[PDB]
Amino acid sequence: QDLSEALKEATKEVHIRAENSEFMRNFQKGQVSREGFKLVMASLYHIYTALEEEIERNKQNPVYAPLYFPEELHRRAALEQDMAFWYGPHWQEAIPYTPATQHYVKRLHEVGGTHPELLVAHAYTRYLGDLSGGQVLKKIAQKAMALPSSGEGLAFFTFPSIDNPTKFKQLYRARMNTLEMTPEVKHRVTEEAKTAFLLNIELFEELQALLT
List residues binding ligand HEM (CB under 6 A): 7-8, 15, 18-19, 24, 28, 124-126, 128-129, 132-133, 136-137, 169, 197, 200
> Which residue, 91 or 135, has its beta carbon nearer to ligand HEM?
135
Q: Read off the amino acid at residue 161.
A: S
According to the annotation, is 8 in a ligand binding site?
yes
Closer to ligand [C-]#N by Cβ: residue 31 or 178? 31
Binding mask 123-142 for ligand [C-]#N (x = CB under 6 A): ------x--xxx--------
Residue 7 interacting partner from ligand HEM, ligand [C-]#N, none (CB closer than 5 to 8 Å by kind) = ligand HEM
Cβ-based nearer residue to ligand HEM, 92 or 167? 167
Query: Do residues 142 and 155 lie in contact, with contact meaning Cβ atoms separated by under 8 Å?
Result: no
Does the annotation flag 173 for ligand binding? yes
DSSP conformation class of 66: G
The CB-of-45 to ligand [C-]#N minimum distance in angstroms stands at 17
- End-to-end, the C-alpha distance of the chain in Å comes to 43
**165 is an interface residue for ligand [C-]#N by CB under 6 A:** no
Which among ligand [C-]#N, ligand HEM, none contacts residue 65 (Cβ within 5 to 8 A by kind)?
A: none
Q: Which residue, 15 or 75, has its beta carbon nearer to ligand HEM? A: 15
Question: Are the C-beta atoms of 79 and 51 separated by less than 8 Å?
Answer: no
Binding footprint of ligand [C-]#N on the chain (CB under 6 A): 129, 132-134
Annotated binding-site residues read 8, 15, 124, 173
